[PDB]
Amino acid sequence: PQKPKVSLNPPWNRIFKGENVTLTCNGNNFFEVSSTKWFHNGSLSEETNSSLNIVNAKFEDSGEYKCQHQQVNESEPVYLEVFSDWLLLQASAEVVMEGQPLFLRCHGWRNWDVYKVIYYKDGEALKYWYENHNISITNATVEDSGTYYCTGKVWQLDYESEPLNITVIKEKYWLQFFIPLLVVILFAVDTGLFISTQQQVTFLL
Amino acid sequence: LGQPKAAPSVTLFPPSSEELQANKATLVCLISDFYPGAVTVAWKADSSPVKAGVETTTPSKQSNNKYAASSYLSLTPEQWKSHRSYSCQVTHEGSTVEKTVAPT
Amino acid sequence: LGQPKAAPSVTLFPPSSEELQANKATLVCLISDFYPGAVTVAWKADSSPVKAGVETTTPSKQSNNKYAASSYLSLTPEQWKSHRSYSCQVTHEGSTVEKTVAPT
Amino acid sequence: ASTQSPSVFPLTRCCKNIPSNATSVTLGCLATGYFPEPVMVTWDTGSLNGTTMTLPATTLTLSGHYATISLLTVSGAWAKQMFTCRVAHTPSSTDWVDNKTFSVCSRDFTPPTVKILQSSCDGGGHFPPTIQLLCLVSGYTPGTINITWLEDGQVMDVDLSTASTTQEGELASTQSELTLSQKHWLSDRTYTCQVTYQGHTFEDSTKKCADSNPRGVSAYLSRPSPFDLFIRKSPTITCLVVDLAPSKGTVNLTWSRASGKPVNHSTRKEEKQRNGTLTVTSTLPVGTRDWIEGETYQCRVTHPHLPRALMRSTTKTSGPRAAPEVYAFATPEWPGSRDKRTLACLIQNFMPEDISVQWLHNEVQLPDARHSTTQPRKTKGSGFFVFSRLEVTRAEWEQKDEFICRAVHEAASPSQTVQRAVSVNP
Amino acid sequence: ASTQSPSVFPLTRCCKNIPSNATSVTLGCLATGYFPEPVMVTWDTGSLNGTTMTLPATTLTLSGHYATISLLTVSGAWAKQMFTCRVAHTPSSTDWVDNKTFSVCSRDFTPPTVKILQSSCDGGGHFPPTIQLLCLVSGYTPGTINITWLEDGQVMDVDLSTASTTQEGELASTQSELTLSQKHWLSDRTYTCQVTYQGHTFEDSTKKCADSNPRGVSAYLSRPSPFDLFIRKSPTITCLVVDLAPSKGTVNLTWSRASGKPVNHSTRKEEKQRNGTLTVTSTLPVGTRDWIEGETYQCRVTHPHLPRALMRSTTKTSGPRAAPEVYAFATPEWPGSRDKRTLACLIQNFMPEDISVQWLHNEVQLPDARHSTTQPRKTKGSGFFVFSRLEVTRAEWEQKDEFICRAVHEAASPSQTVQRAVSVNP
Amino acid sequence: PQLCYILDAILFLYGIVLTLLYCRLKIQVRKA
Amino acid sequence: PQLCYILDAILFLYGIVLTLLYCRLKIQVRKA
């Protein structure tokens, strides 16, 4: 065993009430077919069978979820929320790391059609288009990190989505010193060669 | 049978609008000039007769010697409206004529 | 002068439908009793004259001692259609008369 | 069970059933809802000769009521002669008699067929500068046909429309032509060619053929009109839900308060609109005491599809108080309009927005349609102003030469009302 | 030169040109392309005998062939008289004579007008399952008719269509119908009606109406206010476009006129909004005279995102014209506000909607944003109305004691403006 | 570029010191 | 960084130039 990790079939944590989601976890060592174990809200669930399923998500089917293989540890809890809105902001990897991609989506209740979707980052507009479109950053940065929210038009009425919040977390400083170390080596070679050779010249005169 | 048989004359009056507005459905059929004062009154709705809610007065003569009757079919206004058409049949001779009454 | 001066009389006939459909556009203005045979005949389109397609007939006398002439503006139907109107200006005995004829 | 007042309704043989060449017409009156068996039925045929006969009442086992049919037979112009049936019950009362006059044969008019055709858009991709609407009434029984055009439920000037008639044989057909601007048509306003003819009326409506994207439900919360809240002292707020399609499902509307205290019994009304949608109006009679103390009310609207229940709230608005100032103006005589005049009223400098305006003549309030008013707007300084306009005919001021403009407002100290009198001729 | 048969054609003065009461009507026959100078011309006017005259032959400039006009003058019913002209050329042949019959009013041409009317959708904005297109032709001389309907340039069976004809006086009308499925119409496929007349045939094309809002982008076209149209004499019209998604491109906004005449140069401006959207505004100076003659302008927009142009026509308001009536009043003094006053000007009974107002003191107009004016409201009778109010300080009415309420309206007298004087303390 | 700036300044100072030492030793050699 | 690297290369060039200049003195001390 290695460390069991969970994954959501639709990568988004935030879901609408009545929206299905199935989350399953595996350390890539499903060799013993030993029925894994699940906890949520620090309770015990009777679904030893892997691939936990949430069908018709209710307001009580949200919470911290953990799984433990037959002997291995339980691993980190992936949270879950369920909302009842018109527009929902769904982000994949809400706590993604800097080098990694990013992705956002403005879901409309019951798959209704949103128009004039504007994405706001930190209270300053970011992109406008005539219909739904997804923001899709391919290599996060330390500057694209802050509360977002989309604005849309459903049934020709203006609606807004409660804000999300993305955050980006950061090289070998030793390598940078080494490159300065190499620069110092070259400079010292030149300076010492010059001064010491001149000193030998003086001692030879 | 002391007098020659008289062909019944049946007139079907469509239900009154004011009476219908009062949640009452009444279909009136007046039978007059019928020497054979022994007939059966039947109220038919759509394609089949409506026996329920139909009452016919006993045949009698009012200074005419002919059996005249007032067959009234009573039913809820919704039931009458559902029926495509109303028919009143008086069975007293071999040439019975059915009077047709409809809301419009 | 051998005879008193006579004011020319000019009558212009716009081309008919048959002439227009005949692949030609000929407008004829006939001038009668125009001095002794000296007169100026001009054909103009709208407000400008035409220097081509215009033929003038020398004055002639037929038992009248006067001068008779015919001015024929000949051109394609498109040229006549383009012009707003056809003006047949006849000057004789010091008097100028302009006749305005249009197909309409 | 108790005595019941008898109800008598006419009933006659159908005109189609009755032979056209058969002058004799048999009709009658059916009397029901009279518990006492005895009954007196009188049939009058007017000038036309008529004979009235009575038959035993037919008991109704379903409800216990007795039904008696009195048959009147007339000869000659029976249909043209009115038949009057009077039914009285002696046990009920000496004067408890109901008399109804009706004709055996009723007038019948073919319902004219109305269609609306539109000026075909320019074949390239667009419309001409002006759009024509042709409202055509097809074959119908000739008569004083009246054609009108409703600018979204409101009749506009007839001159804008042009009406013409045609008579093919004995069959009549009418054509009405109405021209509107391109901007008007593009503004998406429903136009209805309501047709009024002998008997009843018929109508058809049209609007710009827009795409499929319904407008979506919405709600609005009223407020007690000061007239009701101060003169009648019977305030009633209203929750108006509009744009909900007349399908899918109904809407549940709940009346709550800030304190959650018991609420009165609200009254709900559902109405279908010409623009294709349904509307709901719920009136809640609030207590004057609740409003004076600013007790907030609340309308909560739930729909089986809406993610969230729509919320609306109302309460006495807070701000300084200043009584209104009233001025009355009478228009001097204008040439060509000597027989009618116009009066104006200016109400200004009142702090809280809501206000009521009345036009009193002969110490009696006139119909509200007789005048027009402007919604309060913020004056350049502090306050509000409103202009009221009224139109008067000759006889109207001939009866009396003095009108009154009255402003009813909470700020007015004496009785929450200030009146000013104006006479056309000084 | 080469000998050819002369061509003889009739030539008669127009009926309007020929006096109605004139007792003499002159027509004739003109022969052209007759190389041989000799020619025989004979004129006949039925039973009536007229005067026949001939003129010297004139060679055609193009070819030189002799051409001659023979003129016959008749008296009486010359318009209905038949003029027969026989022209022969002896050199051409011994019997090569051509006779042509014509009259002043022998015949003419009657080009009819055609238009297509479709089936207007239900008041809800939903197309009917079946759509009816009826193309009507009017003002055609009686004769053979061959109807046709080209769907995208192709014709389907005639059973889908029905043709009816009628005639009143001399004007003839024809109606050809056609029925299409809603899916077919939604397919956005152009159709056209045609009627074969004299071998040339006519064509009127119609197709599905465009959106008028390609992808939610909206355009608004303004109008020139009467104050500009007459007082400043510098009218302009503005085209605004909103909700554009920024890109590496530009909107090809242009202009035009109904007649295609030249248009002055126009400005342009693009602005970025906090919404991440882009607005574009353009302005075009206009001719006040042209505006009075109703030359309809039109703003046309284009973009890479939008799939179709976004055009918006504009013009002058139609309908009957009526001058406005203007009154002005001064609000009496009220305690506690002695140092200020209010002046109210009422304007009414002007059929056109557009009207501008201004307040003039010391013969110099007061600032635009110092007075409040409503929007026109239809009166119970005819003509709109508008109120306007201003506040005057003590000094303005103290140093000078006269105010002017001026209203600028299209039909307002030759000056197009009506003014009234107000004295605070007369 | 705090580290880079410090390295650059140190390199410049070291170069100046080396040049001064070269001048000193050159004086020692040529002068004798 | 990249500008810093180019500056490092220029510094190496300057050091090489200084070494070339001092080559004459070194040879004179050792050889001449």
Partner: protein, 157 residues
């Protein structure tokens, strides 16, 4: 004439220093990290260690002339002439190699945006590319200087 050889021992020492610098500018990289793993296409000669000959050539170019500084032999003169010709060729070779390396480094920086995107691998690539470019430039310069110095020996006999 005699000026070109003014320096024969000085030229020898300078050539030795130039060759040592040219080699060392990339020897540390070759002894530190796998240059072949260097991404960004700036590893044209980092992993190969081509200067393994280049700088050496420069040294060799000087070496054949160095003997003429003290020994003063015609055979040393011919060796110096050959070494100088080889250094002249190697100068162009190294100049072209360094130009290619600089172009590759510029392309890699532009693609990865090393001005602001200084990732760990980006820093390693920058250091390695600098090492390789310095080695190539020093090797080319050593070839040129060795040829210039040995011109004196070439003219000696």
């Amino acid at each position: 004439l005699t000026v070109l050889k003014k320096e024969q021992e000085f030229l020898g020492v300078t050539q030795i220093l130039t060759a040592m610098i040219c080699l060392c500018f990339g020897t540390v990289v070759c002894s530190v990290l796998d240059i072949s793993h260097i991404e960004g296409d700036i590893f044209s000669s980092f992993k190969a260690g081509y200067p393994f000959w280049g700088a050496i050539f420069f040294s060799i170019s000087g070496m054949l002339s160095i003997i003429s500084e003290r020994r003063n032999a015609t055979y040393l003169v011919r060796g110096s002439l050959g070494a100088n010709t080889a250094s002249s060729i190697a100068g162009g070779t190294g100049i072209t190699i360094l130009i290619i390396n600089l172009k590759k480094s510029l392309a890699y920086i532009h693609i990865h945006s090393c001005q602001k995107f200084f990732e760990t691998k980006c820093f390693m690539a920058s250091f390695s590319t600098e090492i390789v470019v310095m080695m190539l430039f020093l090797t080319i310069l050593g070839l040129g200087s060795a040829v210039s110095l040995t011109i004196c020996g070439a003219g000696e006999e």
